[PDB]
Amino acid sequence: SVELPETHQMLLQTCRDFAEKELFPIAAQVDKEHLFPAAQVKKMGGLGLLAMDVPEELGGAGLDYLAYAIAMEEISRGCASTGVIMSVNNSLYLGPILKFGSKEQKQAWVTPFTSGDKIGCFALSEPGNGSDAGAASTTARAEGDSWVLNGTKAWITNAWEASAAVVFASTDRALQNKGISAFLVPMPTPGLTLGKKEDKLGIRGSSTANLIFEDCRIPKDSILGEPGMGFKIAMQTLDMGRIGIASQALGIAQTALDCAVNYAENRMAFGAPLTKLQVIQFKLADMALALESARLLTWRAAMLKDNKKPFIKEAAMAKLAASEAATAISHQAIQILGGMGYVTEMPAERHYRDARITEIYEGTSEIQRLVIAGHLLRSYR
Amino acid sequence: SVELPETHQMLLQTCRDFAEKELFPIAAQVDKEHLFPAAQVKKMGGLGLLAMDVPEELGGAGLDYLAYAIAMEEISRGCASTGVIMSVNNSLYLGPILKFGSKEQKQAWVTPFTSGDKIGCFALSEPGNGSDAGAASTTARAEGDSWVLNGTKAWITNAWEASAAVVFASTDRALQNKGISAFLVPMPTPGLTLGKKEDKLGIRGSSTANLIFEDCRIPKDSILGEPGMGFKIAMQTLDMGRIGIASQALGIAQTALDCAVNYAENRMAFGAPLTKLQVIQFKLADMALALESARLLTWRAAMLKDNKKPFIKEAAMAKLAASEAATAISHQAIQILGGMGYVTEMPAERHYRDARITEIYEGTSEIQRLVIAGHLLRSYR
Amino acid sequence: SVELPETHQMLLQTCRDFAEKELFPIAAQVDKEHLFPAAQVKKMGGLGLLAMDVPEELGGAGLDYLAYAIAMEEISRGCASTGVIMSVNNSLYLGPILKFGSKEQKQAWVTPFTSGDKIGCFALSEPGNGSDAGAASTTARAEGDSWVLNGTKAWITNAWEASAAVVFASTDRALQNKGISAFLVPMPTPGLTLGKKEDKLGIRGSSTANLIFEDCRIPKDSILGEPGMGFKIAMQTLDMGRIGIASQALGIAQTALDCAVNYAENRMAFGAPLTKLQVIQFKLADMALALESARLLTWRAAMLKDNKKPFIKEAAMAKLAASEAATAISHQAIQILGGMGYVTEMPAERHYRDARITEIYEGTSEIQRLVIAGHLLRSYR
Amino acid sequence: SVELPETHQMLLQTCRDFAEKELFPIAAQVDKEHLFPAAQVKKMGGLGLLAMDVPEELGGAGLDYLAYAIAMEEISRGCASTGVIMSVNNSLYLGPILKFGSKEQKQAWVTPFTSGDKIGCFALSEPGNGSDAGAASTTARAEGDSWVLNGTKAWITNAWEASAAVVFASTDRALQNKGISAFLVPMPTPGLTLGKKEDKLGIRGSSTANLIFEDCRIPKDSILGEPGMGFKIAMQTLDMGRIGIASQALGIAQTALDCAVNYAENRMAFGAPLTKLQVIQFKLADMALALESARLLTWRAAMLKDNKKPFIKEAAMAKLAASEAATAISHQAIQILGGMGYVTEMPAERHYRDARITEIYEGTSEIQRLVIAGHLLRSYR
Ligand SMILES: Cc1cc2nc3c(=O)[nH]c(=O)nc-3n(C[C@H](O)[C@H](O)[C@H](O)COP(=O)(O)OP(=O)(O)OC[C@H]3O[C@@H](n4cnc5c(N)ncnc54)[C@H](O)[C@@H]3O)c2cc1C
Ligand SMILES: Cc1cc2nc3c(=O)[nH]c(=O)nc-3n(C[C@H](O)[C@H](O)[C@H](O)COP(=O)(O)OP(=O)(O)OC[C@H]3O[C@@H](n4cnc5c(N)ncnc54)[C@H](O)[C@@H]3O)c2cc1C
Ligand SMILES: Cc1cc2nc3c(=O)[nH]c(=O)nc-3n(C[C@H](O)[C@H](O)[C@H](O)COP(=O)(O)OP(=O)(O)OC[C@H]3O[C@@H](n4cnc5c(N)ncnc54)[C@H](O)[C@@H]3O)c2cc1C
Ligand SMILES: Cc1cc2nc3c(=O)[nH]c(=O)nc-3n(C[C@H](O)[C@H](O)[C@H](O)COP(=O)(O)OP(=O)(O)OC[C@H]3O[C@@H](n4cnc5c(N)ncnc54)[C@H](O)[C@@H]3O)c2cc1C
Ligand SMILES: CC(C)(COP(=O)(O)OP(=O)(O)OC[C@H]1O[C@@H](n2cnc3c(N)ncnc32)[C@H](O)[C@@H]1OP(=O)(O)O)[C@@H](O)C(=O)NCCC(=O)NCCS
Ligand SMILES: CC(C)(COP(=O)(O)OP(=O)(O)OC[C@H]1O[C@@H](n2cnc3c(N)ncnc32)[C@H](O)[C@@H]1OP(=O)(O)O)[C@@H](O)C(=O)NCCC(=O)NCCS
Ligand SMILES: CC(C)(COP(=O)(O)OP(=O)(O)OC[C@H]1O[C@@H](n2cnc3c(N)ncnc32)[C@H](O)[C@@H]1OP(=O)(O)O)[C@@H](O)C(=O)NCCC(=O)NCCS
Ligand SMILES: CC(C)(COP(=O)(O)OP(=O)(O)OC[C@H]1O[C@@H](n2cnc3c(N)ncnc32)[C@H](O)[C@@H]1OP(=O)(O)O)[C@@H](O)C(=O)NCCC(=O)NCCS
């Protein structure tokens, strides 16, 4: 119900302790220097936080997706870039392989990646089409006994750190979505070149680059599932990723609210603490309401996924509400902090820049509203 | 969890069937003619919907407050005035008596009122002070063996139909809240006169009047609890009423959304259904999300109350979010219907006028935000 | 510039004096009883307020459109239904005849209507299509020497009081807009039947009905301009009407703000006036800014029209901003008044219901945003 | 009226030409490297853009404040940091000296600063109090024939480039505002030390530091006006600065809208340009409406100042509306650009970070709403 089980409570406490011990001292350094936190990722792999959905047989933690959402929220509260790296590795790489790959592919592509030594990446977007995922131009000709890949992916998270890749290329151009086919591409491999890192406004610990495939050949076993199923795999992986991104936005909004409340209590204006002003109280009330409401939606989406029931509309609602709430709460936290919120000495601006991204990737807000509207009208029809 | 138990599902189905059978044909007539639906209230008392929180020993249904929230949402979806009458009788009259009254008072003031033959009313507000509940000017002098009541209450719901009253009068003026004392006043009684009915913008089935007490004397047993506890009784009854009003606003928003979606699918513009337009889809998506989020907040508040845990901040959040969401959804439904939404032939304007009230009574939105802000700052401190 | 000329100032003062003398005592009676204010319309015709754009040669006042906007704002501040009647008679009937009709048609259809004895109506909308104005199904066969009209118009303002009608019927069905042709139809005439009055949520002084044409024949001179120009005539008349409706929404928002400020200063809560609370001050500040900004937009649109320059985007912006600001200000005024705002004794709910309409007729907000977007993209291209 | 005079049109064209020639190529470099654009400031001084309000006798341009607002909007459209430097030098330094200083002080402190070789700074805020300007703790003891200054100012714009300073120190502590006294402090002078530059989220061309006064002595003539008038001088200078900041926010919103519209027309999604989507059109319409509405308010405030009439409420409204509109438009521009808007290669994120500041300095939005509310209630009383 509303309360959490003992395992979930213990995981929440452990994640909060780890976050306050490790991520908070280094978050500013990671943001400023664009430094990939290798040691923190290794420690998270040691704690099993990178393989929560993975069964314990394959080396994972064997936990439900609600526990994953809680851990993602706590980690993103600690550090946003570490949060998005964890979210990518947990959902976007591990989920499709467990859900669709054969047992040999699971053994060869999940077990090394549970320990945290290696991480994965999700390669769907292209420079030509960002939202229209079905219009991917990457071609995968089945010449000989190998899949020859030609094309250029873009915006690939963890491109400079991943040891594997889930690449979606259209085997058949005529088939807009049917042609789409997934492939498990090891990194580094001949024929694959990594693009230059992109300077980003917000999350800067993670490395974002453009994968370029030039006559890249992979063995025939590297195809995920069967040809044609690529679009469905992409959609389901996107739903799970949307749940993860909603958790990340919740964490960002929570830490922004905590910093704002602490500063408002500490700061003195007109001979009184700022909390005595009614405007500040109303701002805090609205922020808390938005944050809690979103958290509820997220938890509902996670529990619906755990009960093996359809959750696409719920996940889209959770992602949209969490992203918008995080942006509004971060903006109001900057406004409450005032002048001190603008300088980089205080962490409010980092929360603002990190919260801005949650409305862009994993489907923009317009795409989320399209999904919600379609499912709503289908429900009434 | 997210799912509902079998009893709750059966109650939801029964309430929906009763609503579609009875309330929908007569809602327009009730709104237009200011007609109190006596037969519908009697049938609801027959179904036990007026005594859900009451134990079965005293003649109630013995159901949890979550079931009460579900039934309130369904009834308010059927008809808003019937919804507010049910909410008043269930929470604001029955709850304080069960929570604080002695067993003899329970037998003499709850058992006749479970059947639906008689209903109660909550008398707190005064013309002088609406939000400042602690500034009530009604005086209750303890002369002789009877409590002599002098004063004028205002805005009393069901004043023209109630057979009992929960009246709060300040026994001690010096004590702003300590002086406040509750009293169980039977109606009609000598010394009590009912004010004229007030024409209202929205809910017009219910009768709202001003109770006037002129030397009204009641026996000494009619006092609820002990003197001084009146303010706490009022606050707890207000929390339960806020949960009920949140359920009512949810019902209004739900029926407005249903009518808007049906009309949008039926209406043809520019050679296409209105749902083909992206603006309509985005409006429907935003409306859906709002309602669902509010519902979760409401259900969380109800479950927290059922588990015997503090729920004041949760109830305030649920009431605020539900009221604002209901107003926004009703306005957008009128906008979607366009010209046909403006005339009284279509039920959109009735939903608008009924949804406007949920931000005013049971504490305005500013008071709710004050409560949320106070509890938030207390949580951080 | 920002200041007003002496003629405009004198007209503003005269309109305000007339409004406070006449419209304010009878506004509640007009709203409640659906009473057409014949005497007030006659007095306005005596003051020349119904023929402001009309040259003095034809019996008008010969004033610029800025003066018309000011007078419309003041009258709608006095009474909303009188405001919409004045707006219809000034813009939607008189403007197209002066702009496109020949001199004989001006003499036979403008000079009697300047005095205020008779008023006109604008017949464009149909039950089939409300926003898609080009899809009108009314047919005008040119049989013999007369135009035979068949079809059914809908939502015609002043249908029960108009002595003339501007009816737009598609002469050629193949021509979606080219077929559209305007006609000056006298009322009453054989073959024309008036539909039943429609009960409306808001403005109820004006009479809204559905014109039904059954073999209605008019002389050949009654056609406005030449066939095919009907759509352009409709668009320009709509622009002028949008300016008028923006002025009306400004008046409604202004009177709502005045009542809210007066009540907030008078009402006492927590031992202080409501204006001492910071939340009330912030609400009043937001309301004020909105109204003033909208007024400027309106005044800019009116001055651009007076200088014989294109004003379509400006008029659309003014109408959209004025309507949204009026709705928000009326809602906040009801919220500020609290319980007393809900009853019909206070005039806040009347302002709410009257302000709701300004987002529906003369093009809904979505159509206004489409016009603004089209003109913006055309400006950049 | 709505149109601009020939001088204003010529100044607008010259400012736009200069902006597109100089500021646009170097804006990204200035933002990235925190580089003070010395050459651009010198060229602006050559064009007279730094001394617009200054009479031509003292070496200024002798232009009205409307021309200053237009030039500020164009320059801030070119580059935001250059815009805020120009705004500070024009209003916050030059205005108080011309308005209150004697002729000798004008000759010794305005004529060298019109040419653009030297610039000024406005020193009011302190680390202790940011919004409560009357609680400044800087002390100015009148020992001997010199004013000995002790205290620490904060957030001083152009602290590392100014050759003069307007410092406000409380001569009399007992007098909260009466004690406040202004002083013209040359820079550099013995006893004055410049604090370290502060890394800021947005505008980074300008240098922001903390002035520290330790036994700084100035001649007796350096006091501006007479003791006690400091608070009034600060308030009037703040009003003029609010007009300038509103112009800057207008420029930022305008360039963000231009970039967003151009990208939306260029980008192709789902086989169509983005402008074909109705959601994009509605976003563009809302952005254009907000921008134009604000621009109007700003121009009204500037013209009211030029006509020697009170403009405090108008300036506060203009600043608030311009800041909020700029933030909303920048956020929507980032959303429209999508993924490409997030990287630093595109200029959308720079517009976002620069537009965030306009709600903080020159009085936060809460202070603006307090000023508007006070003037509104004073108007009704
Ligand atoms: C880039 C930049 C440049 C600057 N340049 C200058 C300059 O040239 N000269 C100068 O003098 N200063 C300058 N400042 C400082 C400026 O005055 C302050 O940063 C800003 O105006 C508010 O200061 P604060 O945040 O410290 O106020 P705080 O009092 O610390 O603000 C706390 C919060 O409480 C709110 N608040 C406070 N009192 C009330 C109230 N009564 N009612 C409601 N809400 C309230 C505020 O709005 C704010 O959100 C600059 C600041 C920045 C960031
Ligand atoms: C009080 C009143 C007075 C009136 N007076 C007159 C009068 O004097 N003369 C006259 O001719 N008419 C009059 N009308 C009718 C008026 O034209 C319509 O009521 C109104 O303009 C819209 O009509 P509709 O709701 O039927 O349109 P509908 O097409 O039925 O509206 C459906 C909804 O879809 C939206 N929509 C439609 N097309 C699009 C699109 N392409 N993109 C986005 N959204 C879209 C609309 O905004 C609306 O929300 C009056 C109406 C009222 C209520
Ligand atoms: C349909 C209806 C039914 C009702 N039924 C009942 C009933 O059964 N029992 C009962 O006891 N009462 C009932 N009431 C009365 C109800 O308590 C009040 O109408 C409502 O809760 C607020 O009262 P008010 O508007 O008079 O408060 P006011 O104090 O007059 O409100 C003035 C405004 O100031 C705001 N305000 C006041 N204090 C503050 C503050 N400290 N901070 C910020 N904002 C503030 C309020 O939000 C409000 O907007 C009913 C009212 C209505 C309309
Ligand atoms: C930090 C970051 C990390 C990323 N990581 C990954 C990753 O790991 N894997 C991956 O595959 N991609 C990744 N991406 C790319 C991501 O898919 C896109 O950036 C984003 O989802 C949208 O792409 P776009 O802006 O290019 O779409 P565009 O089509 O260029 O967006 C244009 C605009 O139009 C809107 N729009 C488009 N179509 C419609 C429509 N039909 N209706 C309404 N509005 C519409 C969009 O919402 C958007 O506002 C990442 C991007 C970023 C910024
Ligand atoms: C555009 C978009 C919303 C929809 O895709 P489309 O190709 O444009 O439209 P479609 O017609 O393919 O959608 C419905 C089809 O897909 C399938 N599908 C769509 N959503 C699905 C879901 N959530 N689960 C399962 N199947 C789904 C349906 O089965 C249907 O095919 P059918 O006709 O055989 O039943 C999708 O590409 C998208 O989500 N874009 C944003 C996400 C993103 O970029 N994330 C970045 C990762 S960080
Ligand atoms: C104004 C208002 C919000 C708070 O009341 P106040 O008298 O103004 O302020 P107080 O200082 O009394 O509040 C705190 C006190 O009340 C008690 N209290 C407040 N809220 C409580 C709650 N939810 N549960 C229990 N006790 C509560 C606290 O114990 C404390 O007293 P203590 O110091 O002995 O601990 C309240 O009057 C109100 O809710 N008004 C709107 C509700 C309404 O009108 N409903 C209409 C019915 S349809
Ligand atoms: C739908 C709507 C917005 C546009 O009309 P459309 O027929 O759907 O679209 P169109 O292609 O006709 O629009 C452009 C055409 O009309 C003409 N036009 C459009 N707006 C115009 C304007 N403001 N001024 C002049 N001409 C205009 C253009 O010349 C063009 O024709 P061309 O190709 O020969 O140049 C219009 O019908 C409308 O305003 N509806 C809402 C208004 C309303 O109902 N008011 C009620 C009165 S109270
Ligand atoms: C807090 C604040 C809003 C008002 O100041 P206060 O000291 O708190 O309140 P006061 O009582 O002094 O306000 C009214 C007094 O000041 C004077 N005053 C206020 N605003 C004025 C104005 N716009 N023009 C002239 N005089 C003004 C009045 O004369 C009155 O004094 P009186 O009683 O002798 O008539 C002001 O300090 C402020 O604007 N802060 C934000 C601005 C800022 O920080 N800008 C940074 C520069 S980039």
Residue numbers in the entry:
A (entry chain D), B (entry chain B), C (entry chain A), D (entry chain C): 31 to 411
Question: How does the study describe this entry?
Answer:
Here we report the use of single particle cryo-EM to identify multiple proteins from three enriched heterogeneous fractions prepared from human liver mitochondrial lysate. Using this approach, we were able to simultaneously identify and solve cryo-EM structures of nine different human mitochondrial enzymes: short chain acyl-CoA dehydrogenase (SCAD), medium chain acyl-CoA dehydrogenase (MCAD), isovaleryl-CoA dehydrogenase (IVD), delta (3, 5)-delta dienoyl-CoA isomerase (ECH1), aspartate aminotransferase (GOT2), glutamate dehydrogenase (GLUD1), mitochondrial superoxide dismutase 2 (SOD2), catalase (CAT), and mitochondrial aldehyde dehydrogenase (ALDH2). Functionally, the three acyl-CoA dehydrogenases—SCAD, MCAD and IVD—are involved in beta oxidation and amino acid catabolism. Finally, SOD2, CAT, and ALDH2 are all involved in clearing toxic byproducts of oxidative respiration.
Butanoyl-CoA and other four or five carbon fatty acid acyl-CoA molecules are the initial substrates of SCAD. We obtained a high-resolution 3.15 Å structure of SCAD bound to substrate and cofactor using 16,677 single particle cryo-EM projections. The global fold of SCAD is a tetramer made up of a dimer of dimers. Each individual monomeric unit contains a β-sheet core flanked by N-terminal and C-terminal α-helical domains. The FAD cofactor-binding site is at the intersection of the three domains of each monomer. Additionally, the flavin ring interacts with the C-terminal domain of the corresponding subunit in each dimer set. The ligand-binding site lies parallel to cofactor and the catalytic site E392. Residues F152, L154, N207, F261, M265, L268, D269, R272, I342, I397, and the catalytic E392 residue form the substrate cavity. Mutations in the corresponding SCAD gene can lead to SCAD deficiency (SCADD), a rare autosomal recessive disorder.
